[PDB]
Nucleic acid binder design. Structure first.
Length: 232
RNA sequence: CUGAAAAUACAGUGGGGCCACUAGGGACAGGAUUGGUGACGUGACCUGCCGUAUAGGCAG
């Protein structure tokens, strides 16, 4: 349930495997209300490759990434490509588009993203797939589902200690906080329909409407985590 | 006016060599199947002749 309930394992391989499984979107969200510093170390160590990291609780190469403002810049470049609906599924040829919208109207008889709170996935460019993991990985705060950008947007004072515990400056931290809060995912609707996006004709007021179906990250992530639990 | 239109997976190929299922062996005792029953008559196959002939051939 809690972060350091899984840190009790003396074997680092089993620990890091369980931690990497815990912070992946195909499993349940772990509570980090007690553990904010250690949470930041592992979340910022997830930004590296698997074969580049021996242990996720190594503090120094986390500070190597954090002190390097060519590393965190890439992680805040990847926030603009945070979707509620994946346009690159299953065809990846849908070129440089991002759909971020509120869930639709709730219906009693059908299931959609309206039946869950608004969560975000990422889809831009495979080269930066690790750089998203810092700011898109979902965790449990106090008693509330949250990700790093949303929890650093308003409630920064709770994370000041956790961020300054490594030796980050106040100037850099507050400039990082305002640029992250300014670079939060807006209501992104593409200006043009892509060549590889599937369109259909549905009967509208006195004619037809062009409809592009896009999957929701939330319903997919729920079906994935339901499938790993072997429930259906 | 369909998760919309459109779409050639292909070419080549050595599983081979060797081999002991064996020894032993009681299915056994007893047994009431029994009572009662109409194949035809709405049908064709008849009536005669030849022939020594219930042989064999013939006419309506």
């Amino acid at each position: 349930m809690h972060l350091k309930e899984l840190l009790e394992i003396t074997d680092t391989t089993e620990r890091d495997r369980s931690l990497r499984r815990a912070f992946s979107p195909y499993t349940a969200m772990i509570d980090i209300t007690g553990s904010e510093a250690v949470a930041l170390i592992i979340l910022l160590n997830l930004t590296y490759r698997k074969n580049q990291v021996d242990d996720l609780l190594d503090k120094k190469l986390a500070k190597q990434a954090l002190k390097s403002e060519d590393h965190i810049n890439k992680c805040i470049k990847e926030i603009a490509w945070f979707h509620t609906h994946n346009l690159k599924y299953p065809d990846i040829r849908v070129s440089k588009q991002n759909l971020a919208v509120e869930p639709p109207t709730l219906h009693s008889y059908v299931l959609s993203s309206a039946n869950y709170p608004k969560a975000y996935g990422w889809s831009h460019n495979s080269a930066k797939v690790n750089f998203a993991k810092l700011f898109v990985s979902y965790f449990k705060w106090q008693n509330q589902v949250s990700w790093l950008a949303q929890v650093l947007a308003t409630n920064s004072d709770n994370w000041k200690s956790a961020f300054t515990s490594l030796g980050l400056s106040v100037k850099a931290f507050k400039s990082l906080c305002v640029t992250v809060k300014n670079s939060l995912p807006e209501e992104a609707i593409p200006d043009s329909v892509d060549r590889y996006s599937r369109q259909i004709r549905m009967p509208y007021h006195d004619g037809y409407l062009a409809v592009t179906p896009v999957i929701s990250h939330v319903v997919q992530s729920k079906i994935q985590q339901a499938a790993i639990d072997k429930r259906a």
